[PDB]
Amino acid sequence: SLKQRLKGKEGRVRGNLMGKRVDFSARTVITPDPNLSIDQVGVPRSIAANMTFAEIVTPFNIDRLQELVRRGNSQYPGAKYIIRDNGDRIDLRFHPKPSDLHLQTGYKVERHMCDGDIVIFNRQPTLHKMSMMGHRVRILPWSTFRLNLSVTTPYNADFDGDEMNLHLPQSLETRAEIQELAMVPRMIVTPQSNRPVMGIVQDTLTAVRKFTKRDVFLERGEVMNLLMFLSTWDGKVPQPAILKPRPLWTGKQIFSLIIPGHINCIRTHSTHPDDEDSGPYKHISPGDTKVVVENGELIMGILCKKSLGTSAGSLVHISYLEMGHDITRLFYSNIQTVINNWLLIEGHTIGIGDSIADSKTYQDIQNTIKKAKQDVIEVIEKAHNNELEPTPGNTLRQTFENQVNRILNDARDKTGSSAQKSLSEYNNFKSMVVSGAKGSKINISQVIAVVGQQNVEGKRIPFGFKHRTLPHFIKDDYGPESRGFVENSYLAGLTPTEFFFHAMGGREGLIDTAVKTAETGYIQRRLI
Amino acid sequence: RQMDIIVSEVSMIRDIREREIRIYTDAGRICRPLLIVEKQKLLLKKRHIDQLKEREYNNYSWQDLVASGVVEYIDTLEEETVMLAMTPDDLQEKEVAYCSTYTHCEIHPSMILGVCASIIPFPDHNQSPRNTYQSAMGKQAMGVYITNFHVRMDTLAHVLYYPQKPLVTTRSMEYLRFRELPAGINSIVAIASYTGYNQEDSVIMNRSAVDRGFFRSVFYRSYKEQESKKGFDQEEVFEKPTRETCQGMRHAIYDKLDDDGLIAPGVRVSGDDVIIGKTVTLPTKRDCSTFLRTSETGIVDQVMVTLNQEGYKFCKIRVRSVRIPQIGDKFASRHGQKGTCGIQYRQEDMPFTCEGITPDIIINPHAIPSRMTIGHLIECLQGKVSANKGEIGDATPFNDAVNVQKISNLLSDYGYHLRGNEVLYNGFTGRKITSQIFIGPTYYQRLKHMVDDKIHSRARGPIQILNRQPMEG
């Protein structure tokens, strides 16, 4: 009926007047390409041979356009239509009629998409205004869309089979307004939380940390090699930090050529101890911490995501605020290129020597687990003798499970510290958790020491049978084994009655992500 | 137990406190078998094992094992009056006694997993959402699906050229027939950060293995047409349409049609080219002939002509195409490690070792720590032990007889470092690389999702009829 035809989602108003099928729009898969700027994207040549741009004919481009008419739809950089002042449209595709390829001022040639055009790129859902930014076109051979690595974090992309759209501006006012309003260098900082959206985060962040210690001494050859990759370079080679016995540079002295202008910044690094800044050695810092970038050159301090990532007051933020956007674009580019090209000299990996601890960390891990289990037996034995007084605000069940969860939650952070203080300097888990590119300090504890304790519906694993959890245990059992405390790790493997519980917890954590998106995506429409 | 009156599918539940007895003979229940325990010992003696490895010429099987009273079917309601012992060698001994009155016992506690979760090596080392990711991803790994794939005329079947069985195998892939019809190739993987084209879930892969058949395949799709008589003066016929007789005769190249109106098998067919020539007479004819899709360039495999249920002529054309892996295609491990291909380098550009074994596949280190897939690493160590010793390694879940220190003691004897690491050299400059890169053979799968089936563009094409906006799809 005519009500059902003018009704809601995919009707005539929510489906054909606001959102509609458009043309001049392409869609394929994204893959990385670290040799591109932030400002650019790489289009395959078949998409670029199908889409066009209607370009008028003036006496400043008549020769290049008659060249573009004389080759067309056989050679790629050509055209496919000539449009007259009458509005008449003659085609170059099939039967080109070669007596009528003459151009004149006022006509327009419909050109193919070349290098250097301005487009619009998009990933769905578009949750904010950083998710549709105007890139620039460079044309590359194979068959995916190719974009830079730092532009991943606005779009919330990843390169395991995503697809991203691009819409091509047709008129000249709309290409001018996309150029002067919504280019990707013009959108580095956000108005939402007045910090930048784009930071140096992946493999280049771990290698930015390992490029800026005091150990990194470069010889003359890779100073030549790495200085070949700077577009904002003077032409001068800086005089090294060490002149005898043989010339050696440092990482901070090559990194201080990337940092533009004369900007000033003071930050810290993630392993800056709290009781250092009080007493002596506050302006030396024997662990080489407390980054000071003074008059445009990194004097001291190990860099990490606290100084280059997405925070407020970072080095990319200060360089955006003081110098501009055309210089911050070059800053992101030069960091990623020179640190990748050093990173194939240094190299990086993760094995299982990076995931195992020595034979005296394991012993007191089992000593503190045996301590936790014995104390839980004391509490349960205390409650069965009718001797457990409740607390203000709680029942007897609530004070029981709150203090058992207190004991067990205080005895897996201890094993976590026994794992954290037993790593090494050459380790790679620790070299990822520190640098801030990926990982967290509970993953090191679950991989090495104790997985933890699962819980569905916000409490410890419930009696799904009558008075039991699984049919192996005895009725009304309340110990740590019977109700989900996974005391092994990911490397010592899991027992069956424990892998089942870990599957329950991971199931709940998968349901919540499966459900939440509809409610949030409904609120965000109703506000807007 | 010994089957006098009662068929073995009933369930007999006695709840003592409720003071009642429930007996169910109803259909639809689900159940699983178990081993009876007496006073404290089992009932399955060795007398039942030594005449059970002789099934081919003794006539002794599982039904003589049920009818002897040593296994028994238990369902879910009766699993609340039961007292299981999960393993006999550790839970029915004389120790500090947890329970002393067990009434059943499991066969092996790794029979709680399904079909797609019994193809994961070491599932007790992985984070359980990764097990849930791969339990829905070995359902779209291209392999060999059935042995008579020649006779069958299906739409959209993908067949791999050179499959291989895994080197690190669970002990329950002998029972669901994975070594007869496998899907995937044991590949030399390197977990290392090399150029930057394998960041955020991608893969560098060797081009000089792709040139030797690595993850190459073939793609068959079929086409049906069916002649019919719809009116008194309307009839459809397999005829080659000519220009001045039939009306709608566009840029498609009709000359490859034979006298029968059907393309013979062997000739290659590009885009927009007629494969079946059928026409209908006009109420002096108009054609209704089928095309292919856009930009395939395949070869017709076979053409099959028959008569249907009604009694009209009916044809089926199967068309094949070969698909070489390229830099958009999607590969996956057995541990939820999906990711496309990033770029392909030759063999003179991959990082070699001290005997010249470049990796087939380079994956990033960052995919390991945040999602905690360290079953991947143990099959990449166990794979390196198994390719050198000559066995095929065991990865069944709840062993407690395969440790990382035992695998490391075995790898220490064959001239390698006991934690998998090796010294790679650089391929662009020949210099060494300062860290030691974890190398080893793992089992990757090639998934269904390609980039030639997903690329798409548009500039001024067809529009809909009702609202005159561009089309859908």
């Binding site: 969860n405 067990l408 939650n409 897996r412 509970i442 679950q446 997985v451 933890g452 304790q453 699962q454 819980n455 569905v456 916000g458 409490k459 410890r460 996974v486 870990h502 917890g505 991971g506 709940e508 954590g509 | 984070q127 359980s128």
Partner: peptide, 8 residues
Amino acid sequence: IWGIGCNP
């Protein structure tokens, strides 16, 4: 999968 205060 960690604890009551963490994640499941």
